[PDB]
Design a protein around this ligand. Structure first.
Ligand SMILES: [Mg+2]
Ligand SMILES: [Mg+2]
Ligand SMILES: [Mg+2]
Ligand SMILES: [Zn+2]
Ligand SMILES: [Zn+2]
Ligand SMILES: [Zn+2]
Lengths: 55, 50, 56, 55, 97, 290, 158
RNA sequence: GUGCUCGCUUCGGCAGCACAUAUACUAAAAUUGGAACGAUACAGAGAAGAUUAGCAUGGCCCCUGCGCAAGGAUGACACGCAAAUUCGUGAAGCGUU
RNA sequence: GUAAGAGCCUAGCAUGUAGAACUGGUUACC
C-alpha cells in the first residue's frame, strides 16, 4: 500500500477530489435519474478550475 | 505455446459460476448446439453486419 | 486511453496481511520491527475513567 | 560459495566473483543484463565484510 | 480480548522470526477409529493409535515455495434483498431540469 | 492459501498392518501434486519391509473427490476415481487449466471453510445413491503389495554395491510394453484415461446382470436355486414392495419358482434389485427369464 | 431418557440412566458405512489418546518383531481383554514382548571379530560383517539378459 | 558386548541374572517436466503540427532494490466500428372489414 | 536509432513421487 510521499501529493489530492465529487453527485441526484452523466460534471469541474486559474 | 493463461478459453468455462438452483427441477432440460454448415459460413457471418 | 481517470478504487483484502497473512511471508519492513511495545494508560491525576465517572 | 550461489541462482552467468571478492562482468553487458544484475547494498556490504575477513 | 490477542501474537511472530529459535517436543498420541472396518484391514482391530512428532525444522533453510502468485477475487456472499421503498415517481419536467 | 491440518485422510492398506504407527508431521513440507498449494505432509512407515509412504495431495483435493491422500483411491470402496465416477455421475468438472484451477480451488476451499469440515462437499448427495456394480468388485482384503520399495536402479545395471543391505527390491520391473505402465498422477486424479480404471471397467462389463423379458409384457419369473428349506408365504412379504404381485407359480420338484406381476416394469425391477444380489433364508435365490 | 443425543460438553453431572440410554426408533437407510460410523473428519474418528510411551512402543516393537500386540481399543466388544495380530504366535510364545528375556535362544549368526585396535587395516570393532552373507549381489544368469531386454525395450521408446 | 553368579564347575562350553532396546526426506539412482543469456530475421518508444519533464490510476503483467524510498520508455498494458431496460406523429399511395 | 515482445531457437533448473485387480451352475406334466 504505497505512501503519498512527495511526488504523489498533487496526484493524490486530485485523485481524492474527484472521488468526493463522485460521492456527492451520486447522493445529490434524485430517485429517477438514469445514473449516467458523472463524467460530464467532472469535466465541468475541471473546466471551472481552469477558468478560476485563468481569472 | 509459451504462455501461462489464454488456452483456458476454448478448453473450458473460464471462471464458471453455476446457476443457483431452487424450487424447480431443471436437470432434465438441455439446449441444442448450433448448426455447423462449413460450406457457407464466413468470419463476417458469425460477427454480424458492421 | 493511457491518460485516464479512475472511476473505481483498488479494493483491499488481497495483499500482505489480508486473509492468510498473504500465506505467511518472510519479508518485513524496518517500520514493522518492535517499537512502542507498551501501552501507556491514564494515571489517577491525568483523566482515568474512575475519576471521570463521578464528576459533574 | 553463498555469494556465487546467489549469483548462479539469479541466472547471472555473465558475472564473476573472484576469490578476493571482486565482482566483475565476464563480458560487455547489454542494457537489459545491466538492469538485471544491479545488486543492492545488502549483497555488496556482505561481500565487502567477506573481503575484510579474507584479508 | 482473548480471541484477538491470539491473532495479534500470530501476526507479531513474523516480526522477529528467530531471536531465541524455536523448540519442539510435544510428541503426542491420537486414537483413531478407521471407519472402514474389515476383518483383515487393520490387522485385527477396531482402532489404531498413532504417535505424532512434529518434524524438526532447519534454521538454515530459506523459504520453500513461491507465494507471489495471484488469482482474481472470487464471488462474494449471496446477494441481500434490497428492502427499498416503492420507487418515488419521477416526472418529465424534473427529469429535464 | 496454505492448508495446515492435523491427522491426514488415509485408507487402511496405506496406513499399514500395525495398529501402532509412528508418523512425523511437517508443517508446510511439499506442494500438492494437483493443487500446487502447499500442505501439511504426514509421513509414516506402514510395516517392516515397506516403503515409508507419505501424503501426496491436500486435505482439500481429497475432500473434493473422496480419496486417500497417498494412493488416490476411494475411502469407502477402494477403487480408482474413473471407475467410481463411471458407477456414478461426473458433475464435479474440476478445471485442469491453470488459473481456472486455482480460482475453483480458492472458491471450493472457501465453501469448505464456510462449513463444518466433515463431509464430501458435492459428493454427498450423489454418495447417498450408491451400491452399483462397484460394490461387486471392491477389494475385500488389503493390498499390501503397493507398500513396497522401488526396483534398485543399480541392480538393473548389475552394479548394486549394497547387496543384501540395499532396502530396494532386487526383482523384475514391469514390462513397459503395457498400457498399465504410463499412469500420470493427474490422469489418475481427474478420472481421465486411467488404464487401471480401464481394466476394472472391462472386468465390470463381463459381470452378470439382470436382463429384459424375451417377449412383451411377460412378468413370468423363472427362479432357480430355491431350495426346500424355505416357504412361499415369506416370498410375498419380501416381494410385495414392488406392487400387487400377479401370478405365483411354485414348483419344488425342480426347486423353481415362477412369478407374475401386474406390469413388466415391476418384473424388470425384481430382476435388477434381485439378480446376483438377493439372498433370504441364508440361501441364494437365483433368477432368470422363462 | 432426559438429555439431548449429541450437542457436547454437559454443564451438569449426568446420571447413567440420563445419558447412556439408546436412541429410539429405526435407523435411516440413507447412510453408508462411512456415514453411519461416528466419524470425525472424512475417514473416521480421531481423538487425543494419552498412552504411556514405553507401553506403546513396547507393543509397537512387539508387533514389528513378531506380529502380535494387545488391543488399544477403548471398549470394543465389551470384555476385559484380547490380543490382535497373528494370534497363533501370541499363545505359542506365551505373549512375550521385545523388552523381556526371550524363551527361544538358538541359531545365532556368525561374524568376524578383531577387537584390539592394534593391527592397522585389520580392525573392525562393531563394523564386523557376517561370515555367511556377502556383498555385491549380481542377479542371475537369465535375469541379466532379461533386464538387458527390458532396457532395450526402454531404448526403443525415447 | 561386558560384569556378577559361594552355577554346573573347568579355566573349554553351557545355564541364570543385570545393564545395554528401533537409524534413515530410506539412492552411489532410474525417471519426469520446465527452464540460459543471448544470438536469429521482424520490431521502434505517450499527450489532438513538431520537440519534449513527468506524477498518477486498474490488475490472472512483471524486473532492480532491505525498502511503506526510488528507478525500470511517464516500466509495460489501457486506444474501444465506446449502442443497457423502453417509443410515438402527420399526411400520401395501395389492398382489406 | 536500445529492452518489447511475439515468437523462436537452442537450452536448463527443479523431481527422488503416487500407481500395477484373477476365479466358474439344473428341467420338467393332461
Ligand atoms: Mg516511476
Ligand atoms: Mg520521457
Ligand atoms: Mg506508471
Ligand atoms: Zn491439493
Ligand atoms: Zn491409501
Ligand atoms: Zn539394490
Amino acid at each position: 500500500a504505497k505512501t503519498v510521499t512527495k511526488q504523489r501529493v498533487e496526484s493524490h489530492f486530485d485523485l481524492e477530489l474527484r472521488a468526493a465529487v463522485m460521492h456527492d453527485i451520486l447522493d445529490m441526484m434524485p430517485e429517477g435519474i438514469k445514473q449516467n452523466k458523472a463524467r460530464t460534471i467532472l469535466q465541468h469541474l475541471s473546466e471551472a478550475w481552469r477558468c478560476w486559474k485563468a481569472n | 505455446r509459451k504462455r501461462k493463461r489464454g488456452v483456458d478459453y476454448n478448453a473450458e468455462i473460464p471462471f464458471e459460476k453455476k446457476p443457483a438452483l431452487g424450487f424447480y427441477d431443471t436437470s432434465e432440460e438441455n439446449y441444442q448446439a448450433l448448426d455447423a454448415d462449413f460450406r457457407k459460413l464466413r468470419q463476417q457471418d458469425l460477427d454480424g453486419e458492421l | 486511453t493511457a491518460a485516464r481517470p479512475t472511476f473505481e478504487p483498488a479494493r483491499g483484502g488481497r495483499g500482505k496481511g489480508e486473509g492468510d497473512l498473504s500465506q505467511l511471508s518472510k519479508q518485513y519492513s524496518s517500520r514493522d520491527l518492535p517499537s512502542h511495545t507498551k501501552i501507556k494508560y491514564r494515571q489517577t491525576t491525568q483523566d482515568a475513567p474512575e475519576e471521570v465517572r463521578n464528576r459533574d | 560459495n553463498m555469494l556465487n550461489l546467489l549469483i548462479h541462482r539469479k541466472n547471472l552467468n555473465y558475472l564473476h566473483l573472484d576469490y578476493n571478492f571482486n565482482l566483475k562482468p565476464v563480458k560487455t553487458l547489454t542494457t537489459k543484463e545491466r538492469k538485471k544484475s544491479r545488486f543492492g547494498n545488502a549483497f555488496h556490504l556482505c561481500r565487502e565484510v567477506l573481503r575484510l575477513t579474507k584479508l | 480480548r482473548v480471541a484477538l490477542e491470539k491473532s495479534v501474537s500470530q501476526k507479531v511472530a513474523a516480526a522477529m522470526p528467530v531471536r531465541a529459535a524455536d523448540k519442539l517436543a510435544p510428541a503426542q498420541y491420537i486414537r483413531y477409529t478407521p471407519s472402514q472396518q474389515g476383518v483383515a484391514f487393520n490387522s485385527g482391530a477396531k482402532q489404531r493409535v498413532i504417535r505424532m512428532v512434529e518434524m524438526q525444522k532447519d534454521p538454515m533453510e530459506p523459504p520453500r515455495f513461491k507465494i507471489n502468485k495471484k488469482i482474481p477475487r472470487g464471488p462474494p456472499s449471496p446477494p441481500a434483498p434490497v428492502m427499498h421503498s416503492p420507487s418515488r415517481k419521477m416526472t418529465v419536467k424534473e427529469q429535464q431540469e | 492459501n496454505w492448508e495446515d491440518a492435523d491427522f491426514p485422510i488415509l485408507c487402511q492398506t496405506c496406513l499399514g498392518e500395525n495398529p501402532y504407527i509412528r508418523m512425523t508431521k511437517e508443517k508446510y513440507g511439499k506442494e500438492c501434486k494437483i493443487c500446487a498449494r502447499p500442505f501439511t505432509v504426514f509421513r509414516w512407515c506402514p510395516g517392516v519391509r515397506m516403503r515409508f509412504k507419505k501424503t501426496e495431495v491436500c486435505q482439500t483435493c481429497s475432500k473434493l473427490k473422496n480419496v486417500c491422500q497417498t494412493c488416490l483411491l476411494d475411502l469407502e470402496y477402494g477403487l480408482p476415481i474413473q471407475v467410481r465416477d463411471a458407477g456414478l455421475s461426473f458433475k464435479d468438472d474440476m478445471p485442469k487449466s491453470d488459473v481456472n484451477k486455482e480460482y475453483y480451488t480458492q472458491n471450493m476451499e472457501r465453501e469448505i471453510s464456510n462449513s463444518d469440515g466433515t463431509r464430501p462437499v458435492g459428493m454427498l448427495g450423489k454418495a447417498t445413491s450408491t451400491s452399483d456394480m462397484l460394490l461387486k468388485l471392491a477389494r475385500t482384503t488389503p493390498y499390501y503389495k503397493r507398500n513396497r520399495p522401488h526396483i534398485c536402479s543399480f541392480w538393473v545395471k548389475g552394479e548394486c554395491k549394497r547387496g543384501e543391505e540395499c532396502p530396494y527390491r532386487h526383482e523384475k520391473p514391469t514390462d513397459p510394453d503395457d498400457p498399465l505402465a504410463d499412469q500420470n498422477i493427474k490422469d489418475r486424479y481427474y478420472g481421465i484415461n486411467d488404464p487401471v480404471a480401464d481394466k476394472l471397467l472391462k472386468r465390470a462389463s463381463t459381470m452378470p446382470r439382470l436382463d429384459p423379458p424375451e417377449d412383451k409384457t411377460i412378468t413370468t419369473l423363472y427362479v432357480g436355486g430355491l431350495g426346500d428349506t424355505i416357504t412361499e408365504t415369506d416370498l410375498r412379504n419380501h416381494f410385495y414392495q414392488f406392487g400387487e404381485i400377479r401370478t405365483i407359480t411354485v414348483v419344488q420338484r425342480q426347486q423353481c419358482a415362477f412369478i407374475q406381476f401386474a406390469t413388466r416394469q415391476a418384473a424388470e425391477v425384481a430382476a435388477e434389485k434381485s439378480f446376483n444380489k438377493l439372498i433370504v433364508n441364508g440361501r441364494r435365490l437365483n433368477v432368470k427369464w422363462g | 431418557v432426559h438429555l439431548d443425543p449429541a450437542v457436547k460438553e454437559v454443564q451438569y453431572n449426568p446420571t447413567y440412566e440420563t445419558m447412556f440410554a439408546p436412541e429410539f426408533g429405526p435407523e435411516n437407510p440413507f447412510r453408508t458405512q462411512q456415514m453411519a460410523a461416528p466419524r470425525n473428519m472424512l475417514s473416521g474418528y480421531a481423538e487425543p489418546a494419552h498412552i504411556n510411551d514405553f507401553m506403546f512402543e513396547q507393543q509397537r516393537r512387539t508387533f514389528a518383531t513378531y506380529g502380535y500386540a494387545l488391543d488399544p481399543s477403548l471398549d470394543n466388544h465389551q470384555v476385559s481383554a484380547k490380543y490382535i495380530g497373528s494370534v497363533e504366535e501370541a499363545e505359542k510364545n506365551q505373549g512375550l514382548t521385545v523388552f523381556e528375556t526371550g524363551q527361544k535362544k538358538t541359531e545365532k549368526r556368525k561374524k568376524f571379530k578383531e577387537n584390539d585396535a592394534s593391527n592397522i587395516d585389520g580392525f573392525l570393532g562393531p563394523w564386523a560383517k557376517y561370515v555367511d552373507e556377502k556383498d555385491v549381489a549380481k542377479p542371475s544368469e537369465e535375469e541379466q539378459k532379461e533386464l538387458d531386454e527390458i532396457t532395450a525395450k526402454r531404448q526403443k521408446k525415447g
